[PDB]
Amino acid sequence: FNIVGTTYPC
Amino acid sequence: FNIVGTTYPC
Amino acid sequence: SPFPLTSMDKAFITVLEMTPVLGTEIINYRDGMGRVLAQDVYAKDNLPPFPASVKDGYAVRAADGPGDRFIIGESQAGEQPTQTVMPGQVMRVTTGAPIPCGADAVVQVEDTELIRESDDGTEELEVRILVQARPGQDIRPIGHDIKRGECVLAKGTHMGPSEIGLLATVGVTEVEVNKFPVVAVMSTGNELLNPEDDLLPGKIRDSNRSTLLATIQEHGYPTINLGIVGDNPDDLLNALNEGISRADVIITSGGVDYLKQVLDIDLHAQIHFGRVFMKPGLPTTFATLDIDGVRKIIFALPGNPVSAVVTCNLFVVPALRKMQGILDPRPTIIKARLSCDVKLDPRPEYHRCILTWHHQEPLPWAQSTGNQSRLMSMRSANGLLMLPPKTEQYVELHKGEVVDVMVIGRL
Amino acid sequence: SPFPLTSMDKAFITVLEMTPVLGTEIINYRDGMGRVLAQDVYAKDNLPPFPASVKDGYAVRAADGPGDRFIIGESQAGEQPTQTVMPGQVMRVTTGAPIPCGADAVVQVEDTELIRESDDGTEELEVRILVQARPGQDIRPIGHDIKRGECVLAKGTHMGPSEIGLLATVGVTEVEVNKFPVVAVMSTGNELLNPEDDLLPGKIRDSNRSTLLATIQEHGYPTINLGIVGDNPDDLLNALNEGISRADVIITSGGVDYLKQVLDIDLHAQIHFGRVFMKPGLPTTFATLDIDGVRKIIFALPGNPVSAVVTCNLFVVPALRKMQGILDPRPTIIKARLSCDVKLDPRPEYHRCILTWHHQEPLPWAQSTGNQSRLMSMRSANGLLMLPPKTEQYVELHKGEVVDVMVIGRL
Ligand SMILES: O=C1C=CC(=O)N1CCOCCOCCN1C(=O)C=CC1=O
């Protein structure tokens, strides 16, 4: 869980 | 790489 | 000031770390929706408390095997039977009826044929049992669903309808829960008028108080409207004192600089951050004030209306969730596909969106609000898109790429 | 013996670690298919070696701008032009033709209109240039594709058709490569007859020599048929000596115990493993023999026909790939969906399969051979399914689940 959006590894 | 088959994590 | 820029991650964690958990109180079980249990709950009886039939049929001795039987009576829902079933007899049962003494199985009605009924046809007298019952067949024994002394709900359980129903089941009608936070909202700014006012020169209608109050109410918490407050020390300090006195949480929007001065100098509150490296939301401010060994929390949100609602969902709602006892108060974050290309900002960026699941597609689409079909331009925001900060590798995201979205509405 | 059980991972790594890389030789470029370069290859001229037209059109002075022009001649593919284009003239060009002296751009024919042709109509005399050419427009300058002195192919490159064509392009017609391994195959077992024989009592036709030879040939390597060898020391030791003398690699199938005895006692070879914890393939044996400071490799595969072919693809083909200089000789392993449920064995398990891609599906289906539609029962194996060893969590895999498959055929 992170409040800061992440990019998708897949 | 592996020569022994795996299960898929996804 | 300009206060140090705080990262979004530190701002968020700081809110959760510093927010307290409210005390507990005893409530009636019907008021338990959305509450968190502050006690374990035990059953004091068995469910069922008598051996109960699973089926419409006949209570039999499995040892009698198949054959022709006198029906000595009927056991029905809500009545204890007074007869004992002897060899070669049966008792009619309905679903839920207690099993009489002397019977050890139930044969469903479809595995039988009635031989004789009373002349008037109201009363069955003799029946052919067509099967060999397994002992205990079609009976729910005493305590099969709940045993006396069993813990049916653990402390920390966040209650919905089925939990309310379980309390009713076990007869535990008063329960200890965490308090809900009381949330006071004000707006500040000399340009603001009440929604009910016609415009005067230089002025606009205050929309934040309404949107923020509605947001909090949608989560179930009591609120207090503190109205519009003149943007000056005297009126700010008084509104803030009336909020502190009336509520657990005070949310202001606008004027973020008399506000940060009153909190620190006149109120003696600890401002933990005053600027957040985010978009929108840069001027957001969080402070706590300890009086009574009671900790008050204060959010000073930006005046811009879009920023006020985004920041409320990112910071305020999780804090309220913690206050009301939810053990993990963090919001639900799901994966979605972007409906449109989007340039990334160096700041983490958040935007209201609508989430929609299409036919047999495993990911929902996230469509950013304000740019919209007819029906889609009409829909209410149920997500907050969480865009990644710009990097050397990622400068732009494209339609169809997979993004994080915080759930803020009913899906 | 029974030799220690070796894990599949150690057996495989041991094969690659212990297999040598063959020496090098000079070949003609046309024989280069499948070879690995043992030298860097440099261009000794420019491509193109003259400024070349990209288009059918006219070579112009861009400075003359648009307007009416005398055509002084034609430059065509394969001829050096002898005229210089002066102000107000042009030269006709075809695609690939060298650009004459004095022209610095090409205007395509579609951006022109012919004004006058010779009476006989064979020869264009004057043309209207309708556009302003950018200088160097529609010209490939000297060395635009390849520069003299540039390295066009690196040592270690595993050559296919386009690399053969690049050698031709640069005029490097003799090149240094790794040798291909020469592979000798025999079968052993007193029950075996040649394919060409009618059955006698107690006997069956030898199919492994044929399947194994074909497998190796399909990869492009020369082979030697050593035939069927009597399963006894004397004939085994001689066949093995004739194999060692004739080849880099010796593959036997059957008799795995005179075989392992001759290798160790009479041949003085190092047996690295003799049993592998795998299915099928348990009795597989690998040994090396160093004579001349030349290392020979020896595979003794199981007699069972399915096992012989699976083991050849898992162990032998990668070794041959190493021998012939391929830097990473490991096989290609892709993801597929199982077409049928399958119980896992405690041993890692391998089975021939057919891989098929369906309409707009990102994963192929893997269908295990032998159980099959008509057309599917007819198809040739292009994969080896690699099933995981049984665990407490995974005892069974289901239709649709994602598995590893080693590619063993043309897709
Ligand atoms: O990161 C993803 C993306 C899908 C998903 O289920 N996960 C969690 C497990 O991923 C671990 C690392 O993923 C990279 C390799 N990988 C895939 O691309 C898909 C599964 C998988 O392991």
JSON list of N, CA, C and O in Angstrom, two decimals, chain A residues 1-8, chain C residues 9 12 333 350 386 388 404 406:
[
{"chain": "A", "resi": 1, "resn": "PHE", "atom": "N", "xyz": [0.83, -1.23, 0.00]},
{"chain": "A", "resi": 1, "resn": "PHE", "atom": "CA", "xyz": [0.00, 0.00, 0.00]},
{"chain": "A", "resi": 1, "resn": "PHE", "atom": "C", "xyz": [0.85, 1.25, 0.00]},
{"chain": "A", "resi": 1, "resn": "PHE", "atom": "O", "xyz": [1.68, 1.46, 0.88]},
{"chain": "A", "resi": 2, "resn": "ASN", "atom": "N", "xyz": [0.64, 2.11, -0.98]},
{"chain": "A", "resi": 2, "resn": "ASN", "atom": "CA", "xyz": [1.29, 3.40, -0.99]},
{"chain": "A", "resi": 2, "resn": "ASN", "atom": "C", "xyz": [0.33, 4.49, -1.43]},
{"chain": "A", "resi": 2, "resn": "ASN", "atom": "O", "xyz": [-0.37, 4.35, -2.44]},
{"chain": "A", "resi": 3, "resn": "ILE", "atom": "N", "xyz": [0.30, 5.57, -0.67]},
{"chain": "A", "resi": 3, "resn": "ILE", "atom": "CA", "xyz": [-0.57, 6.69, -0.95]},
{"chain": "A", "resi": 3, "resn": "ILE", "atom": "C", "xyz": [-0.17, 7.38, -2.25]},
{"chain": "A", "resi": 3, "resn": "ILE", "atom": "O", "xyz": [-0.98, 8.05, -2.89]},
{"chain": "A", "resi": 4, "resn": "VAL", "atom": "N", "xyz": [1.09, 7.20, -2.64]},
{"chain": "A", "resi": 4, "resn": "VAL", "atom": "CA", "xyz": [1.59, 7.77, -3.88]},
{"chain": "A", "resi": 4, "resn": "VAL", "atom": "C", "xyz": [1.49, 6.76, -5.02]},
{"chain": "A", "resi": 4, "resn": "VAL", "atom": "O", "xyz": [2.07, 5.68, -4.96]},
{"chain": "A", "resi": 5, "resn": "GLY", "atom": "N", "xyz": [0.75, 7.11, -6.06]},
{"chain": "A", "resi": 5, "resn": "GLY", "atom": "CA", "xyz": [0.54, 6.21, -7.19]},
{"chain": "A", "resi": 5, "resn": "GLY", "atom": "C", "xyz": [1.84, 5.61, -7.69]},
{"chain": "A", "resi": 5, "resn": "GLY", "atom": "O", "xyz": [2.86, 6.28, -7.74]},
{"chain": "A", "resi": 6, "resn": "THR", "atom": "N", "xyz": [1.79, 4.34, -8.07]},
{"chain": "A", "resi": 6, "resn": "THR", "atom": "CA", "xyz": [2.95, 3.69, -8.66]},
{"chain": "A", "resi": 6, "resn": "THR", "atom": "C", "xyz": [2.64, 3.28, -10.10]},
{"chain": "A", "resi": 6, "resn": "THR", "atom": "O", "xyz": [1.48, 3.37, -10.53]},
{"chain": "A", "resi": 7, "resn": "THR", "atom": "N", "xyz": [3.66, 2.85, -10.83]},
{"chain": "A", "resi": 7, "resn": "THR", "atom": "CA", "xyz": [3.48, 2.31, -12.19]},
{"chain": "A", "resi": 7, "resn": "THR", "atom": "C", "xyz": [3.41, 0.80, -12.10]},
{"chain": "A", "resi": 7, "resn": "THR", "atom": "O", "xyz": [3.75, 0.21, -11.09]},
{"chain": "A", "resi": 8, "resn": "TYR", "atom": "N", "xyz": [2.94, 0.17, -13.17]},
{"chain": "A", "resi": 8, "resn": "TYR", "atom": "CA", "xyz": [2.65, -1.27, -13.16]},
{"chain": "A", "resi": 8, "resn": "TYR", "atom": "C", "xyz": [3.81, -2.11, -13.69]},
{"chain": "A", "resi": 8, "resn": "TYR", "atom": "O", "xyz": [4.10, -2.07, -14.88]},
{"chain": "C", "resi": 9, "resn": "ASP", "atom": "N", "xyz": [4.16, 10.92, 1.13]},
{"chain": "C", "resi": 9, "resn": "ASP", "atom": "CA", "xyz": [4.36, 9.78, 2.05]},
{"chain": "C", "resi": 9, "resn": "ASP", "atom": "C", "xyz": [4.58, 10.19, 3.49]},
{"chain": "C", "resi": 9, "resn": "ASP", "atom": "O", "xyz": [3.98, 9.61, 4.37]},
{"chain": "C", "resi": 12, "resn": "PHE", "atom": "N", "xyz": [1.29, 11.77, 4.84]},
{"chain": "C", "resi": 12, "resn": "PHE", "atom": "CA", "xyz": [0.24, 10.78, 5.12]},
{"chain": "C", "resi": 12, "resn": "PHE", "atom": "C", "xyz": [0.50, 9.97, 6.40]},
{"chain": "C", "resi": 12, "resn": "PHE", "atom": "O", "xyz": [-0.41, 9.75, 7.22]},
{"chain": "C", "resi": 333, "resn": "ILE", "atom": "N", "xyz": [-7.22, 0.75, -2.39]},
{"chain": "C", "resi": 333, "resn": "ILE", "atom": "CA", "xyz": [-6.59, 1.18, -3.62]},
{"chain": "C", "resi": 333, "resn": "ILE", "atom": "C", "xyz": [-6.69, -0.01, -4.59]},
{"chain": "C", "resi": 333, "resn": "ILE", "atom": "O", "xyz": [-6.35, -1.14, -4.24]},
{"chain": "C", "resi": 350, "resn": "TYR", "atom": "N", "xyz": [-3.44, 13.76, -8.10]},
{"chain": "C", "resi": 350, "resn": "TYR", "atom": "CA", "xyz": [-4.68, 13.07, -7.71]},
{"chain": "C", "resi": 350, "resn": "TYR", "atom": "C", "xyz": [-5.80, 13.75, -8.40]},
{"chain": "C", "resi": 350, "resn": "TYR", "atom": "O", "xyz": [-5.85, 14.99, -8.46]},
{"chain": "C", "resi": 386, "resn": "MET", "atom": "N", "xyz": [-4.57, 8.13, -8.76]},
{"chain": "C", "resi": 386, "resn": "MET", "atom": "CA", "xyz": [-3.29, 8.41, -8.08]},
{"chain": "C", "resi": 386, "resn": "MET", "atom": "C", "xyz": [-2.17, 8.33, -9.07]},
{"chain": "C", "resi": 386, "resn": "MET", "atom": "O", "xyz": [-1.64, 7.27, -9.33]},
{"chain": "C", "resi": 388, "resn": "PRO", "atom": "N", "xyz": [1.50, 8.62, -10.70]},
{"chain": "C", "resi": 388, "resn": "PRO", "atom": "CA", "xyz": [2.90, 8.65, -10.30]},
{"chain": "C", "resi": 388, "resn": "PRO", "atom": "C", "xyz": [3.61, 9.94, -10.63]},
{"chain": "C", "resi": 388, "resn": "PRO", "atom": "O", "xyz": [3.23, 10.65, -11.57]},
{"chain": "C", "resi": 404, "resn": "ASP", "atom": "N", "xyz": [-3.24, 3.14, -10.30]},
{"chain": "C", "resi": 404, "resn": "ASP", "atom": "CA", "xyz": [-3.81, 3.04, -8.96]},
{"chain": "C", "resi": 404, "resn": "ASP", "atom": "C", "xyz": [-4.95, 4.01, -8.85]},
{"chain": "C", "resi": 404, "resn": "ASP", "atom": "O", "xyz": [-4.82, 5.14, -9.25]},
{"chain": "C", "resi": 406, "resn": "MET", "atom": "N", "xyz": [-7.82, 5.22, -5.73]},
{"chain": "C", "resi": 406, "resn": "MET", "atom": "CA", "xyz": [-8.33, 5.10, -4.42]},
{"chain": "C", "resi": 406, "resn": "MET", "atom": "C", "xyz": [-9.85, 5.11, -4.49]},
{"chain": "C", "resi": 406, "resn": "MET", "atom": "O", "xyz": [-10.47, 5.88, -5.16]}
]
